[PDB]
Amino acid sequence: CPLMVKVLDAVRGSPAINVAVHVFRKAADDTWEPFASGKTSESGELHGLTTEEEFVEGIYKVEIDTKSYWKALGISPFHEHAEVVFTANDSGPRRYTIAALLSPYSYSTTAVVTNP
Amino acid sequence: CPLMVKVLDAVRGSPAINVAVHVFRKAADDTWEPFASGKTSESGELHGLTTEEEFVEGIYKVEIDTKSYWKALGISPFHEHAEVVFTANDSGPRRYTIAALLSPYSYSTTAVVTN
Amino acid sequence: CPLMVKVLDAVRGSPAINVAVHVFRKAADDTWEPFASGKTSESGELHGLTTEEEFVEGIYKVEIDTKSYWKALGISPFHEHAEVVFTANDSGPRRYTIAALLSPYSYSTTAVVTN
Amino acid sequence: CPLMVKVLDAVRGSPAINVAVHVFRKAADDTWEPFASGKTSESGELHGLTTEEEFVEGIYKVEIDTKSYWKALGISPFHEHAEVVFTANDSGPRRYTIAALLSPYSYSTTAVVTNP
Ligand SMILES: O=S(=O)(O)Oc1cc(O)cc(/C=C/c2ccc(O)cc2)c1
Numbered sequence: 149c150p151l152m153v154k155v156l157d158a159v160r161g162s163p164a165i166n167v168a169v170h171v172f173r174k175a176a177d178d179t180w181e182p183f184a185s186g187k188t189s190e191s192g193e194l195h196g197l198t199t200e201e202e203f204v205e206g207i208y209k210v211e212i213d214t215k216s217y218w219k220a221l222g223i224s225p226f227h228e229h230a231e232v233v234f235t236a237n238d239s240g241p242r243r244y245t246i247a248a249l250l251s252p253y254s255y256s257t258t259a260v261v262t263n264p
Numbered sequence: 265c266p267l268m269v270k271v272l273d274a275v276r277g278s279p280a281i282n283v284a285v286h287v288f289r290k291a292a293d294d295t296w297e298p299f300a301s302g303k304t305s306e307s308g309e310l311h312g313l314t315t316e317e318e319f320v321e322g323i324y325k326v327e328i329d330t331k332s333y334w335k336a337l338g339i340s341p342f343h344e345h346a347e348v349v350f351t352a353n354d355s356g357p358r359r360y361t362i363a364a365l366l367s368p369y370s371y372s373t374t375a376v377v378t379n
Numbered sequence: 380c381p382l383m384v385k386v387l388d389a390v391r392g393s394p395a396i397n398v399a400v401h402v403f404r405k406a407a408d409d410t411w412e413p414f415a416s417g418k419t420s421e422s423g424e425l426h427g428l429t430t431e432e433e434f435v436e437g438i439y440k441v442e443i444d445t446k447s448y449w450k451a452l453g454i455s456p457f458h459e460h461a462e463v464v465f466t467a468n469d470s471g472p473r474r475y476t477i478a479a480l481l482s483p484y485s486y487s488t489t490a491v492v493t494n
Numbered sequence: 495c496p497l498m499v500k501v502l503d504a505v506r507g508s509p510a511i512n513v514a515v516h517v518f519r520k521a522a523d524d525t526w527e528p529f530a531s532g533k534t535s536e537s538g539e540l541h542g543l544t545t546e547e548e549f550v551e552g553i554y555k556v557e558i559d560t561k562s563y564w565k566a567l568g569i570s571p572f573h574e575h576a577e578v579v580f581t582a583n584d585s586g587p588r589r590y591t592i593a594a595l596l597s598p599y600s601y602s603t604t605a606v607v608t609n610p
């Protein structure tokens with residue numbers, strides 16, 4: 149599992165469960181091609197998005213659907229989504245964890261990158 | 265001034281100076297149309313992007329060119345850029361400040377929406 | 380004004396208004412001596428805490444009374460208060476801004492140190 | 495394990511390893527009594543600080559020695575340490591994860607609180 153997403157809720161002090169995540173990859177013609185998607189589990193984690201073989205070098209966008217999360221909880225938030233855009237695997241395969249901490253009018257995202 | 269951008273540097277403990285910022289508005293065909301842009305000042309701020317007349321309700325994207333900022337400082341960063349995507353609403357308060365606090369592998373953004 | 384405190388609310392997307400802030404200086408016996416205090420203004424800021432003459436090198440603690448803030452808004456918070464502990468140094472720039480961004484179960488603090 | 499500490503480094507995009515952590519508990523006479531201490535592992539985690547029996551109700555302070563972390567890496571940071579102060583177990587036993595994301599002039603801390 150070379151791409152994992154972890155989401156926390158800063159209002160409840162809990163994992164952010166059932167958060168939809170869509171990953172895109174920049175194609176040769178410079179558009180955002182859909183790459184993988186999923187939703188966070190009861191632990192606020194999303195595993196199984198892709199494989200080492202399919203997660204080739206490229207520029208990736210991880211869109212975390214924060215508005216859809218907050219609205220399903222009946223709250224009106226500020227952002228449409230949190231976007232995390234990065235070049236991956238350009239020095240060989242790595243494992244990436246994208247973490248996000250959510251509030252209704254704010255979020256903070258960090259990457260943990262490890263070398264198998 | 266209905267839209268301001270403030271950028272801080274969490275490594276140096278300073279404003280983030282001369283950071284390029286591009287603002288886009290979502291068009292009817294879901295493409296991102298250029299709207300306004302500039303570079304942050306010595307105080308890490310970018311004022312004068314738009315006017316109340318032009319800043320109508322809709323979805324906007326503020327792209328902060330963090331990669332160039334870190335590279336100019338000789339530091340290797342993670343993100344291509346920081347992105348802040350939000351709906352402008354006339355119901356709420358009138359002035360939007362988008363603030364971003366930058367680290368090489370992490371950022372933190374909030375909205376301060378006031379009258 | 381060598382020391383300013385700025386407090387933001389990440390739930391409401393606003394300055395955090397009327398938040399009590401207490402600043403202490405570490406004494407020779409390692410106790411915390413009261414130094415200055417106030418409440419944030421309508422812009423979430425607290426100015427006028429000290430003077431350049433009084434703000435000598437040393438270790439300071441800025442305590443932000445976040446628990447009372449959240450309770451006044453009818454929200455149940457995690458932390459008793461937010462604490463920012465740092466050394467003032469004459470070598471670096473002259474003006475310290477301690478900023479804090481508050482959520483019920485989380486905060487984010489940075490220092491903006493300028494001339 | 496009812497009290498766990500997780501620390502990340504926002505400069506390196508990695509766990510913050512070998513970070514010293516000291517936990518204190520407010521005593522009846524209102525001073526900070528030493529309660530437990532340890533240091534983060536290669537995964538940036540600190541387990542085994544206390545037990546369910548010993549982690550009674552009280553006000554706790556988790557001091558994360560960020561200055562000692564940054565200086566051991568040869569960098570001069572702003573804060574002395576990050577302090578996380580909270581009432582614990584006042585509605586019965588809970589499990590607490592205190593997470594912190596570190597930069598030289600900034601940090602962000604969050605709590606994840608779960609009910610066994
Ligand atoms: O830089 S200043 O001295 O102007 O002080 C300010 C003024 C201001 O509007 C905002 C801020 C800080 C915002 C901020 C944003 C995200 C975080 O995770 C933490 C803090 C600091």
Ligand SMILES: O=S(=O)(O)Oc1cc(O)cc(/C=C/c2ccc(O)cc2)c1
Nearest residue numbers: 154247249256258500591593595602606
């Ligand atoms: O507390 S947990 O059990 O969720 O453990 C984890 C695991 C993990 O990959 C990340 C985190 C915290 C990340 C985090 C991210 C951004 C912030 O501004 C503050 C904290 C916490």
